[PDB]
Amino acid sequence: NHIKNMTPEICKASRALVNLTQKELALMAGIATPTIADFERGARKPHGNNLRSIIIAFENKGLDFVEEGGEIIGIFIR
Amino acid sequence: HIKNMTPEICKASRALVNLTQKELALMAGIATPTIADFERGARKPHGNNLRSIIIAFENKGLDFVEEGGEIIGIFIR
């Protein structure tokens, strides 16, 4: 897709909008829980399939991200 | 035009701008227990409290999109 990055702030905000724990996001996205924890503290940046899976998990929970130049600039709640 | 903010939008908005509850409360001119109780879903902010919370977020660079009096979106500046 067209999103190239997701900041810790956007990850954390997106979980709060749809009442997701880290463990449930990890399970939906098929990623280890501590890796999710690393993305949220900025210890690693999500890229590739990890980034695509986290985006899809949030969209499946009814979020829609607004992208500009590869960066998320907005979140709509559907 | 915003008539309600959900606890989820308040928590999400603090995450977007790295504010603690105490910090949001200081910006909104409200006591921290009021913010904490709002985020627990125990009370719904109304009136001047709701307005002060929205303004504190806008001052931190969020823009809200409103429909039917509800927030349906948040933009980061």
Side-chain angles (χ1 to χ4, degrees), chain A residues 3-8 11 31 35-36 38-40 42 44-52 54:
Chain A
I3 292 158
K4 294 326 197 324
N5 289 296
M6 176 179 293
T7 61
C11 198
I31 293 172
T35 294
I36 294 298
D38 287 339
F39 295 157
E40 302 197 336
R44 283 151 71 186
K45 292 194 169 71
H47 290 138
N49 180 54
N50 279 340
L51 175 59
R52 282 192 274 282
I54 285 161

Side-chain angles (χ1 to χ4, degrees), chain B residues 2-3 7 11 13-15 18 21 26-27 30 43 45 52 55-56 59 66-67 71 73-74:
Chain B
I2 299 165
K3 289 327 173 82
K11 288 173 266 178
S13 294
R14 287 198 302 104
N18 296 296
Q21 291 181 329
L26 183 67
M27 297 199 54
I30 290 173
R43 73 175 71 188
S52 291
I55 290 165
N59 291 347
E66 167 276 313
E67 181 171 18
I71 301 171
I74 312 168

Side-chain angles (χ1 to χ4, degrees), chain A residues 9-10 12-14 16-19 66 72-78, chain B residues 8-9 11-13 15-18 65 71-77:
Chain A
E9 291 89 347
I10 290 277
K12 285 183 275 187
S14 292
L17 284 173
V18 302
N19 289 294
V66 178
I72 297 172
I73 60 167
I75 312 178
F76 278 106
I77 301 104
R78 97 231 190 207
Chain B
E8 291 71 20
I9 294 273
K11 288 173 266 178
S13 294
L16 289 173
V17 300
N18 296 296
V65 181
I71 301 171
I72 59 164
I74 312 168
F75 279 95
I76 306 116
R77 265 175 275 170

Side-chain angles (χ1 to χ4, degrees), chain A residues 18 20 24-25 28-29 52-63:
Chain A
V18 302
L20 270 178
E24 194 179 325
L25 178 57
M28 293 184 78
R52 282 192 274 282
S53 296
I54 285 161
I55 295 164
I56 286 165
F58 289 132
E59 292 166 337
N60 282 332
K61 294 298 269 196
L63 297 188

Side-chain angles (χ1 to χ4, degrees), chain B residues 10-42:
Chain B
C10 186
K11 288 173 266 178
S13 294
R14 287 198 302 104
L16 289 173
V17 300
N18 296 296
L19 286 171
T20 65
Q21 291 181 329
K22 186 170 183 200
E23 285 172 337
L24 174 57
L26 183 67
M27 297 199 54
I30 290 173
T32 312
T34 295
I35 296 293
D37 206 55
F38 171 33
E39 294 193 348
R40 286 194 291 271

